[PDB]
């Protein structure tokens, strides 16, 4: 409801939205503020228009005041050009006059005047105070390069402190910032309740934090935690304009030390004291309602001559008022714009109606022109161009606090030289190093909730819980990733063991049934002793056969016994060695033929010791063999059926089965990998049946005494060795030992040694007794 016409038609008046009521403003600011800033603005104006050559010498000076508030706020916003355009009231003898109000203070408090100015076309935002959204952007900009995931929040009842917390709420998610707590502190807070929230603070273990509390609001907060003396704590004191003012007590920085906070350096107003000294009781021709509030705040029963010094010096608490400096800069910018349009080029604007920028102004549309796209360079600050989002933004002094043992106080460091606006850039401009607080501890090495676990692991996530907290769990078997903290766990090469990562390998030692290890030595010793005894029995045989008793007995019998032992032992030697498919083709028929002809020699010895008889006729064959050819062809027919069935399974399809080991996980052993070998089992069974034959001829040998009782030994040795071989063959066929050490080899070598001990030893002794054989 105030109305302050002043030097020039541009009249910077109207009700100030910062005041919400007559009583509010009377007992909030004026009772001890009090509207002196506009007096300084008018000084500067009258001092600069005297400097200027007739800047705006059009209208006069006059102050008339009459003090929700929306009705009178808009009514004081009402100029006179709006209510006299046509307005043909027969009783209104109106005349042309144009005032125009621009200044708005406390715009955040009341937005109805802003809406009115929007609808009328006279919108003028200069809140001239920089908004807290830029401070939230700055706190985010210090979030990224700290390289830390979550952070805590503390707020208060301040109206300006809310938009920051909501903005943090909608910006945290897209760049994984987690919030553990965000609680309000009032002017007075309960004791046990504050203890409860701080207790859940230690419960949360969210050590990094940002506080939006004001000075008197944060003073109790620094007070309570002194009692328990937990002092590893770091803060982020935003909007810390009054840095170390209410926290200046000693032993407090033992808890609240090392805090980094934003600040704005404010240029001191030249002669502020003498600016405020001019107001005196009842010598004031202008601003009569300055006089009324002076009367009503100092009730006027008495006190009609006191000065400001006589009053209780109300100019110590506010040495430099933020709103005063902001409106000072705003009015300076407006005056500079007025000077500019007084000295602008001859040219026109961009708006169709009201395009009259001359010595006489129409609706003050050039002022917004010079605000939007012109520099200011006022009050030794070098201000940026006025913008809607940010009016006048300077370099934010991110101050750091250091304890001073020599002074017992806090020293400030301008090491933070940065701003979020695009005047210097969107990137980093902060100095991080060469500072300390009881050591180098602000890096907070354990600010991340989860650690970098060992390679080959998924940072398993709790469902419905922020991605910051992850616990590491081990990748499935046979799969391992190289670098740590790998979400895409990948397959690992099969060349290493579990190697503290639970991996798998396929390349290991391969059993070739012969190695430098002692089993190979033992089997080689058995083989060489067998070969040596075969050589010795060959020598004794060649000794026996040199005598002319040859062809009086059957030399072919012993000759084929020697061939049988040689081939059966050759099969035993072929049994060991590196196993492949070609070795199996060279081995299996050899095994079959060795078995069948060794056993055929046994049978031909058992059935008839002496020569066979047959008819004497001339045929294709020779005559001297005296019937041995039938025994030869019987053994031969066995041999054929064996090798022809061998070639039958050869040419049809090579006998290769699936590659199998003892265990597919860690054991890689090459085997025969041939197959079931049904016909091989059939011929083995036929050989066993042939061994079962000629038992009764062995019995016809047990009755009669033959050649001084040698065939009985053959008979019982037959029995015992055949039964032991047939009892130990399925153990080899079933037991796992065949992989580690073949049992068939030892079984067959023992059987062959027994078979030779059946007759060779006995008749060697006999010929040692009687050489005539």
């Amino acid at each position, epitope marked *: 409801d105030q109305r302050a016409q002043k030097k020039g038609d541009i009249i910077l008046g109207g009700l100030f939205p910062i005041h919400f009521g007559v009583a509010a403003k009377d007992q909030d600011l004026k009772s001890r503020f009090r509207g002196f800033r506009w007096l300084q603005a008018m000084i500067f104006a009258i001092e600069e228009i005297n400097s200027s050559p007739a800047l705006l010498p059009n209208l006069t000076l006059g102050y008339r005041i009459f003090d929700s508030k929306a009705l009178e706020a808009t009514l004081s916003f009402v100029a006179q050009n709006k209510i006299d355009s046509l307005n043909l009231d027969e009783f209104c003898n109106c005349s042309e006059h144009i005032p125009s109000t621009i200044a708005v203070v406390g715009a955040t408090g009341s937005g109805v005047s802003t809406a009115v100015a929007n609808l009328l076309g006279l919108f003028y935002i200069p809140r001239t105070i920089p908004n807290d959204e830029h401070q939230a952007t700055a706190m985010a900009d210090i979030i990224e390069y700290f390289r830390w995931n979550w952070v805590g929040t503390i707020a208060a009842d301040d109206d300006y402190g*809310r938009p920051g917390i909501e903005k943090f709420r909608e910006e945290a998610e897209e760049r994984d910032i987690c919030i553990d707590f965000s609680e309000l502190i009032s002017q007075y807070s*309960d004791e046990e309740e504050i203890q*409860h929230v701080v207790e859940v603070i230690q419960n949360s273990t969210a050590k990094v934090i940002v506080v939006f509390s004001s000075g008197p609001d944060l003073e109790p907060l620094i007070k309570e935690i002194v009692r328990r003396n937990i002092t590893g704590k770091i803060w982020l004191a935003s909007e810390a304009w009054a840095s170390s003012s209410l926290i200046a007590m000693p032993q407090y920085f033992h808890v609240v030390g090392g805090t980094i906070g934003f600040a704005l350096k404010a240029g001191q107003i030249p002669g502020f004291r003498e600016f405020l000294k001019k107001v005196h009781p009842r010598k004031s021709v202008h601003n009569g309602f300055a006089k009324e509030f002076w009367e009503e705040t100092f009730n006027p029963l008495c006190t009609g001559d006191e000065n400001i010094s006589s009053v209780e010096t109300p100019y110590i608490d506010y040495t430099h008022l933020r709103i005063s400096y902001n409106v000072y800069l705003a009015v300076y910018s407006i005056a500079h714009a007025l000077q500019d349009i007084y000295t602008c080029l001859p040219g026109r604007g961009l708006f169709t109606n009201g395009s009259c920028a001359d010595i006489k102004k129409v609706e003050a549309w050039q002022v917004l022109k010079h605000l939007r796209h012109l520099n200011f360079t006022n009050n030794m600050g070098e201000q940026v161009t006025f913008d809607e989002c940010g009016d006048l933004v300077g370099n934010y002094s991110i101050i750091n606090w250091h304890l001073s043992p020599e002074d017992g106080s806090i020293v400030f460091k301008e090491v933070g030289y940065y701003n979020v606006y695009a005047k210097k850039g969107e990137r980093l401009f902060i100095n991080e190093e060469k500072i300390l607080w009881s050591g180098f501890s602000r890096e907070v090495p354990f600010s991340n909730c989860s650690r970098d676990c060992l390679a080959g692991t998924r940072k398993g996530i709790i469902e419905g819980e922020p991605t910051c907290c992850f616990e590491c769990v081990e990748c499935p078997d046979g799969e391992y990733s190289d670098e740590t903290d790998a979400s895409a766990c990948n397959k690992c090469p099969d060349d290493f063991w579990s190697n503290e990562n639970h991996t798998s390998c396929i390349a290991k030692e391969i059993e070739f049934l012969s190695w430098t290890e002692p089993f190979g030595i033992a089997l080689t010793l058995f083989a060489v002793l067998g070969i040596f005894l075969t050589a010795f029995v060959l020598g004794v045989f060649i000794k026996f056969r040199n005598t002319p008793i040859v062809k009086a007995t059957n030399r072919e019998l012993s000759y084929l016994l020697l061939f049988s032992l040689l081939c059966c032992f050759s099969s035993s030697l072929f049994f060991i060695g590196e196993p492949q498919d070609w070795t199996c083709r060279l081995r299996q028929p050899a095994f079959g033929i060795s078995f069948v002809l060794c056993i055929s020699c046994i049978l031909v010895k058992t059935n008839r010791v002496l020569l066979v008889f047959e008819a004497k006729i001339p045929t294709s064959f020779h005559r001297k063999w005296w019937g041995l050819n039938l025994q030869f062809l019987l053994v031969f027919l066995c041999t054929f059926m064996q090798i022809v069935i061998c070639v039958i399974w050869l040419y049809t399809a090579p006998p290769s089965s699936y590659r199998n080991q003892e265990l597919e996980d860690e054991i890689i052993f090459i085997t025969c990998h041939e197959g079931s070998l049904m016909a091989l089992g059939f011929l083995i069974g036929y050989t066993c049946l042939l061994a079962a034959i000629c038992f009764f001829f062995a019995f016809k040998s047990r009755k009669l005494p033959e050649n001084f009782n040698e065939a009985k030994f053959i008979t019982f040795s037959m029995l015992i060795f055949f039964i032991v071989w047939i009892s130990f063959i399925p153990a080899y066929a079933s037991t796992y030992g065949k992989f580690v050490s073949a049992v068939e080899v030892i079984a067959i070598l023992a059987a062959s040694f027994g078979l030779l001990a059946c007759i060779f030893f006995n008749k060697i002794y006999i010929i040692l007794f009687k050489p005539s054989r």
Partner: nanobody
Framework: QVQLQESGGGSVQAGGSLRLSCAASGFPISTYDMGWFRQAPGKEREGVVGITDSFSIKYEDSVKGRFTISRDNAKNALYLQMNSLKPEDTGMYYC??????????????????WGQGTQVTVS
């Protein structure tokens, strides 16, 4: 990004029980609590119950044991079970999300968010 819904508005006698469920849309209640208040139509809004950000409750003499409120961060939902209510339990149940104090939630006028104000009549 504050959105809430209410479910469970029925009619029961004095001895009857009532189930009330509140579900959020994108809002994690772990970050901040949510207050539930009772306002009979035609009268002012009073906070019969209220939950702090932590797992603590603040009741009044009219909801001693009759009202049970359950909150969990994972499901971002609130549950209210009422047993053996006094006959004038009829009223409007209102949900709010907004930074406040321990006793400032009992008065319940500092919340920025405004709920749909579902009306429940039980008699």
């Amino acid at each position: 990004q504050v959105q809430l819904q209410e479910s469970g508005g029925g009619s029961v006698q004095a001895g009857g029980s009532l189930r009330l469920s509140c579900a959020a849309s994108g809002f994690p209640i772990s970050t901040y609590d949510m207050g539930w208040f009772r306002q009979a139509p035609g009268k002012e809004r009073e906070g019969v119950v209220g939950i702090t950000d932590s797992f603590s409750i603040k009741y009044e003499d009219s909801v001693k044991g009759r009202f049970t409120i359950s909150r969990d961060n994972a499901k971002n939902a609130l549950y209210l079970q009422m047993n053996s209510l006094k006959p004038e339990d009829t009223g409007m149940y209102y949900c709010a999300a907004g930074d406040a104090r321990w006793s400032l939630l009992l008065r319940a006028e500092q919340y920025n968010y405004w709920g749909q104000g579902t009306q429940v009549t039980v008699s």
